[PDB]
Amino acid sequence: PEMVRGQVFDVGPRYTNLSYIGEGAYGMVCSAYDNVNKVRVAIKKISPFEHQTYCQRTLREIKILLRFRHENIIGINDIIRAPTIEQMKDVYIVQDLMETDLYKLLKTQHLSNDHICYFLYQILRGLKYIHSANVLHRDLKPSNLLLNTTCDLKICDFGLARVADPYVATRWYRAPEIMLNSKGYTKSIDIWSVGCILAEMLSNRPIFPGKHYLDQLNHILGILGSPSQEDLNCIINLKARNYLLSLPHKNKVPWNRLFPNADSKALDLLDKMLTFNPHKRIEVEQALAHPYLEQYYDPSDEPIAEAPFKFDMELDDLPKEKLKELIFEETARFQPGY
């Protein structure tokens, strides 16, 4: 079997000429050559079966990405694993090869307004499809937005997704109702994340950083100002509402004071995405029709999912052995003789 940095990478003979790209907590990603289709691919080695949480995320990612088909969402081309469940210790997910992600890009590039608009449109175009399938991504952030060699943006990493029904490292893109531990979240939490990403494209700085939720919440309240009673009522948690009502008053910082050189249309849409009240937060289809994106907006070319999930997976209490069986069955379509 082929080897990369002393690690087994058992994807031959179809996939060869592996090159290390990076690694996460329980896997390694390489580029490779598909000798059968004569194309360059990415291959993610996943080894999740010793931890229930990794199995959860692996199953969700596979189930969702296999059911999605959209230009602005990463696809799965192939999945390699052992022919018997007892021998399956790793799963190799073959994907289109991307060149970078928005996180790395913002480390070195100050984007022009035109390119910010281009990226934002592609994010929202993909998000519209995701939400039409009744799915919340729940982990949108620059590092989960990949770009290929022709500058096409694809949303990736659906391991934290859920079907909509009202332990990550980077929490700077999470909506305030999550920090406040509100009862039921909606599609609006993804819109907030997109607002955070837009702000970071305009300045190359996170807009709401912080060491913890309390700190991050203060950053948010310092920019948006103190919420009104109408807004507070959307926080189901009574303790969170009492807390907020006890804080000193904060005035709203005008967006042009923070982003003095940004397109005023971009700031108007930013305002609608980063509203405290999730019920008043702009929706994906409304964001696409905002004047800031009028150069790109084309509903006839912005497709939706054929059949939404509306099928809460309910994996949170399944033992990792049950989850491994589900992952075995879900990957069986890539096995000869299925």
Ligand SMILES: Nc1ncnc2c1ncn2[C@@H]1O[C@H](COP(=O)(O)OP(N)(=O)O)[C@@H](O)[C@H]1O
């Ligand atoms: N389809 C892909 N093409 C090219 N590079 C890819 C890719 N999917 C992931 N990568 C890269 O491989 C590295 C690890 O990816 P990942 O498995 O998702 O780890 P993580 N902790 O970022 O969530 C990242 O640098 C990521 O950009």
Ligand SMILES: *[C@@H]1[C@@H](C(=O)OC(C)(C)C)C(=O)CC[C@@]1(Cc1ccccc1)C(=O)OC
């Ligand atoms: C492409 C994008 C980019 O980094 O592309 C790769 C191939 C990943 C290096 C950007 O950084 C900005 C947008 C992009 C495509 C583009 C070109 C002209 C007009 C609009 C969009 C680019 O090449 O910017 C210079």
